[PDB]
């Protein structure tokens, strides 16, 4: 994708003022360097590929850090985690996608599981990550029958194994994901994207049977968009995020602080 060349320009004395316009119209000016100055002929050679959406959004970033603290006391009763999937909990990723009103893409998920040794050894640890779409039974314990995964997709990782990874196709029941939603429940509740963005949960359990080593397992989840499309650009988020699915920005006993830096006097740059 090529940037146009800067053409040669000469001294003009004319009735048409390309520099003069009306921005009241809501249209951006069309003035190029050649219209305002006696320009030199330069052969520009820049591709714009890296500025494409595929390039911009097609990078893996963290969207969730799942901590499983293995308890040896009630081994089968606990030792599992549940997380309602979404891209609203980590700022770097969230801000990039919210530059658009609607987005559509496939997802690549890469998992980075880290075992923290709290005993002399870690033994042999194996984890199971299961995707539970809305409506499927959510596991209630480490030994829940739902872990049989008769039809849900599960992925297994054992100590020593490379980072797991798999793709998910565009999941919505609509034609695009809603990055913003000016609407409600059928009950006039839950303003926002909580209504529209119900992708189910990601559940995990330590598969290895009762053992004697305390460990904590932190699995960070990375998401990368593939084959991306987006519509209706929006201004970038100017303040810290406080909640998922809400554009709220007020923090208790703290003033609104944007990234604009003030200066003493506007006649000094």
């Amino acid at each position: 994708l090529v940037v146009p060349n800067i053409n040669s320009s000469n001294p003009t004395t004319s009735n048409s003022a390309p520099a003069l316009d009306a921005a009241e119209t809501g249209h951006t000016s069309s003035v190029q360097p050649e219209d305002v100055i006696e320009t030199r002929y330069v052969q520009t050679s820049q591709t714009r590929d890296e500025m494409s959406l595929e390039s911009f959004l097609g990078r893996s970033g963290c969207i969730h850090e799942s901590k499983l603290e293995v308890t040896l006391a009630n081994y089968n009763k606990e030792n599992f985690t549940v997380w309602a999937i979404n891209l609203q909990e980590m700022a770097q990723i969230r801000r990039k996608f919210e530059l658009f009103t609607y987005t559509r893409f496939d997802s690549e998920i890469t998992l980075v599981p880290c075992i923290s040794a709290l005993s002399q050894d870690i033994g042999h640890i194996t984890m199971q990550y299961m995707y539970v779409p809305p409506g499927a039974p959510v596991p209630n314990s480490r030994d829940d029958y739902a872990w049989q995964s008769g039809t849900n997709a599960s992925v297994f990782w054992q100590h020593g194994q490379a980072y797991p990874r798999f793709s998910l196709p565009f999941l919505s029941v609509a034609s695009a994901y809603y990055m913003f939603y000016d609407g409600y429940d059928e009950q006039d509740q839950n303003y926002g994207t909580a209504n529209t963005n119900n992708m189910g949960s990601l559940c995990s359990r330590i598969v290895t049977e009762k053992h004697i080593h305390k460990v904590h397992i932190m699995t960070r989840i990375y998401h990368k968009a593939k084959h991306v499309k987006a519509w209706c650009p929006r201004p970038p988020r100017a303040l810290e995020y406080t909640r998922a699915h809400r554009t709220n920005f007020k923090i208790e006993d703290r003033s609104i602080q944007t990234a604009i830096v003030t200066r003493p006097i506007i006649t000094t740059a």
Partner: peptide, 25 residues
Amino acid sequence: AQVSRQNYFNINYFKDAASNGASKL
């Protein structure tokens, strides 16, 4: 098939398109 680059080899190995790598611009 083979593609040029900003020449390299590339074919899809899986049956679902979601599996494919980044899109060509």
